[PDB]
Amino acid sequence: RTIGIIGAPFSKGQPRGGVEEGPTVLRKAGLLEKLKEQECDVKDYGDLPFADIPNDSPFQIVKNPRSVGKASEQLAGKVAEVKKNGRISLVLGGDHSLAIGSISGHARVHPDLGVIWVDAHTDINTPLTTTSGNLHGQPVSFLLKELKGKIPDVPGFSWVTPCISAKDIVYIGLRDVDPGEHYILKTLGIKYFSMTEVDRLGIGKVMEETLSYLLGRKKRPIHLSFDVDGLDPSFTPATGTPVVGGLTYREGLYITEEIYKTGLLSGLDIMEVNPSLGKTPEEVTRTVNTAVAITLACFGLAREGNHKPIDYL
Amino acid sequence: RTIGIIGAPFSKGQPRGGVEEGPTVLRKAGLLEKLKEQECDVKDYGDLPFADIPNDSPFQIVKNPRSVGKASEQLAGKVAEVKKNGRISLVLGGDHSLAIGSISGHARVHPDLGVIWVDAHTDINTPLTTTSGNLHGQPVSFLLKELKGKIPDVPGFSWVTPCISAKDIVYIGLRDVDPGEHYILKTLGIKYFSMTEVDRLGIGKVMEETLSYLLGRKKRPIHLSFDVDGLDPSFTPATGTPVVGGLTYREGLYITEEIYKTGLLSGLDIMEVNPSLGKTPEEVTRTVNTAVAITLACFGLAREGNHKPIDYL
Amino acid sequence: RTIGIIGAPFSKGQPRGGVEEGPTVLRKAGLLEKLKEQECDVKDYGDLPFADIPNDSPFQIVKNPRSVGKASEQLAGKVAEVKKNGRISLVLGGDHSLAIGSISGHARVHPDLGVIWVDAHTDINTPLTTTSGNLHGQPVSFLLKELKGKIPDVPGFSWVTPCISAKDIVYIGLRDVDPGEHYILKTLGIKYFSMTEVDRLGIGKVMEETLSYLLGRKKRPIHLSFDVDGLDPSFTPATGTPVVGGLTYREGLYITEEIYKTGLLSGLDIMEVNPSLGKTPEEVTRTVNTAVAITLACFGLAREGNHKPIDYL
Numbered sequence A, B, C: 001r002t003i004g005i006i007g008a009p010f011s012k013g014q015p016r017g018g019v020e021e022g023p024t025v026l027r028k029a030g031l032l033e034k035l036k037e038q039e040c041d042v043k044d045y046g047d048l049p050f051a052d053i054p055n056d057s058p059f060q061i062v063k064n065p066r067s068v069g070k071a072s073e074q075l076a077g078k079v080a081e082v083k084k085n086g087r088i089s090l091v092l093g094g095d096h097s098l099a100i101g102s103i104s105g106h107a108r109v110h111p112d113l114g115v116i117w118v119d120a121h122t123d124i125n126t127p128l129t130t131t132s133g134n135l136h137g138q139p140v141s142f143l144l145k146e147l148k149g150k151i152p153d154v155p156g157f158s159w160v161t162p163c164i165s166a167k168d169i170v171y172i173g174l175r176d177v178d179p180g181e182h183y184i185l186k187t188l189g190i191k192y193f194s195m196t197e198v199d200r201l202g203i204g205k206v207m208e209e210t211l212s213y214l215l216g217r218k219k220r221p222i223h224l225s226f227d228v229d230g231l232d233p234s235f236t237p238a239t240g241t242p243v244v245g246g247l248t249y250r251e252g253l254y255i256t257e258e259i260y261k262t263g264l265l266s267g268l269d270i271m272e273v274n275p276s277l278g279k280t281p282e283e284v285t286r287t288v289n290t291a292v293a294i295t296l297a298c299f300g301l302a303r304e305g306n307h308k309p310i311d312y313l
């Protein structure tokens, strides 16, 4: 397909620093070249320069609010620009707090978008329910219209305007959800397939139900926010918040191959890859290699094989 | 839920000695504290003191019959006492021979109980079909009423009285069954889901069929005897009789989450954890960590998340 | 069952040399003894002596054509001889190019045979579509009647005569298919279950559909060509062309147990085991151990257990 690459070297949504190198190690893995090797029209919009915000004391428990809020604001603008150029935005990011800007900018051009959130976490804590204070665990709360009223005026996010409803999002891969987050899940009736649902139904039925749920009424642009920790740490160990018993490499590729086949992928986020957290150089390459594989599947690379519209014999 | 913890530091049902440290490493992993962290009312009935039986020569091929028989007799009494206190018995054990006492004592208070046996083995050898002579591979034969007549008078087990019928037990995870055991399986018509059935149907259908099979006619108390070697050794390596191709971490949690949701868990055994068999300190923690996780799922810990009956917003 | 073992220490269908030791390490693993331990009548037809062909320059891009062609010709004759003796041929091989001779000889005695190809690759490149020039990636093209006309006269294969039609073969495990191969797949309407189909349907449904597809109309002899790289490299690392995200140990045993139960297994190939490629001695034993396990399942070894037709009690 036609892609718009945008690097988001940002880490202030969480504690560990190596995540801001995500764009770097992914590009170094040959991601752009691999994409072009497929039927892909690629345009690199570069790495966003996230100016340093020295004065950024916590808002209550919430850490680096101004830095996070600004980074998302800048990203929102870049994503909308790539979308206005008629390209699928591909955000190579640092931490998941960037989802606020990615989905926000995406929704500016396509308000009817539907979101698929692949993650071990729901990232739906509010600045008031969070216990860690890390903003990468709160992006969804800022985007949901139903939660508008339970979100205090956190410095750096006055530009935010909830752009999705509880029913325009589906979670896949959940296995470490905070109490307050679970309360929000059940209270708002959010659609989710935790690892339990995946075990019960199988990834095939999960995807069928996911896509039917979001595209049932009518077709709409899809936004895939992919947290690499959604996959089991045996595949993506170099990440800040790993949780055992995750989605397999295969399921990861299944999810993305199915999303690709819809022809509706509109926005994509490959988040939380932290090269500095690899216990070994191999754990780093294993994580980056899996992240690239998942990305390539989102744009057409199929396990059964691919061939050009010609007569090979 | 409401739990009654009882440690069973016993190993004479098999050759390797480290298994008697199971209660110790599990408690040290913070199992009691983790349980209390959930909606659990926990009461530790302590570790059973299994007096030394110096004179215990083999009965034919059967090893340490008096020691094994006595340990189960003592455990049977403790389990019945915890059951009479209105608590779910949680036996942190050594080897699986202890199942004879656990199920026996449990059945004294709840004769209508149904058993789910998660294991790589059927543990249904009789003292006459066993080839190893290890009693942890024969517990089920002593408990089945239909096999009463094929069980010689083994020193130490005169107190035993078969308490379950062939149709009150379901096996999950089988992958190393002895010939005589398979003969008993097919002859008595015992319900089982070997790894082959799990591969064929998926763990979801397996659990649906398991619970429908045991609770179809009417609801009854459930006894879960969980041998950690039922799970693949990539998850629980520190165990005496590991067999490759086992149940995954995920399936292990699925089985237990589903049992929990029935609200009928009445007795639980977490067996065969042998810290001394870990090739590395990490293999030990990996095994103990998985054992704790499985235990927590049996008492409510759900992957989709948990929340108190309050308004979190 | 009744087996006819034939060693095929051959490697010239690909670059890496250790694969010709496959027969050796498998026999050393006790394969013959293990088979006899089951209800198996085993006869070792020995290791085929593949005479050295010093003058064998490439045919265009195609490497070692005369050596490969001769090795398959010799193997075809041996397989037909074992089949005429009323035995299931078990080819312990080197590289997969040997499939040309195995299926060829098998089809001489049983022209109505159906093939199940477990592999990460389709091995259907023609001498003209191949980009590697390695013949182990082209065996199927030489056997398919529909491709007769697109196969140049390659030195060493004048003895070949396509013996199977597009609809007498089913692929399972595909995850690295070349463009030209995919073109052939879709153009000839070949039945396949890539890793994507396995993820979608589950290995149970895959096997049901595979066997129904090949045995629907009427029962016929089955030929299983098993490339060990079909299974994930976490199980069979010592192989020349490994690809991540493969079939699990369990699925491997499921496939073969189901094939065994048909009672129609007529020919079997255990290919691509290369002891020299093991990064460690354990990776070598892990690969050989998995290969033996898969082989034993093909001849009756069931995970639920096995028992002789006698009264064990």
Ligand SMILES: N[C@@H](CCCC[N+](=O)[O-])C(=O)O
Pocket (backbone or CB within 6 Å): A095, A096, A097, A119, A120, A121, A122, A123, A125, A130, A131, A132, A133, A134, A136, A137, A138, A176, A177, A178, A227, A241, A272
């Ligand atoms: N629920 C935890 C973990 C969040 C991880 C963030 N992520 O999934 O990108 C928190 O609120 O800090």
Ligand SMILES: N[C@@H](CCCC[N+](=O)[O-])C(=O)O
Pocket (backbone or CB within 6 Å): B095, B096, B097, B119, B120, B121, B122, B123, B125, B130, B131, B132, B133, B134, B136, B137, B138, B176, B177, B178, B227, B241, B272
């Ligand atoms: N079937 C073997 C292995 C038993 C292992 C015991 N277990 O599963 O707890 C025997 O009878 O010795």
Ligand SMILES: N[C@@H](CCCC[N+](=O)[O-])C(=O)O
Pocket (backbone or CB within 6 Å): C095, C096, C097, C119, C120, C121, C122, C123, C125, C130, C131, C132, C133, C134, C136, C137, C138, C176, C177, C178, C227, C241, C272
């Ligand atoms: N498709 C590649 C890989 C073939 C591997 C051969 N195999 O699967 O036995 C080629 O044509 O060289």
Ligand SMILES: [Mn+2]
Pocket (backbone or CB within 6 Å): A119, A120, A121, A227, A229, A230, A241
């Ligand atoms: Mn996460």
Ligand SMILES: [Mn+2]
Pocket (backbone or CB within 6 Å): A096, A119, A121, A123, A136, A227
């Ligand atoms: Mn996340």
Ligand SMILES: [Mn+2]
Pocket (backbone or CB within 6 Å): B119, B120, B121, B227, B229, B230, B241
């Ligand atoms: Mn066991």
Ligand SMILES: [Mn+2]
Pocket (backbone or CB within 6 Å): B096, B119, B121, B123, B136, B227
């Ligand atoms: Mn056991």
Ligand SMILES: [Mn+2]
Pocket (backbone or CB within 6 Å): C119, C120, C121, C227, C229, C230, C241
């Ligand atoms: Mn292959």
Ligand SMILES: [Mn+2]
Pocket (backbone or CB within 6 Å): C096, C119, C121, C123, C136, C227
């Ligand atoms: Mn092959």
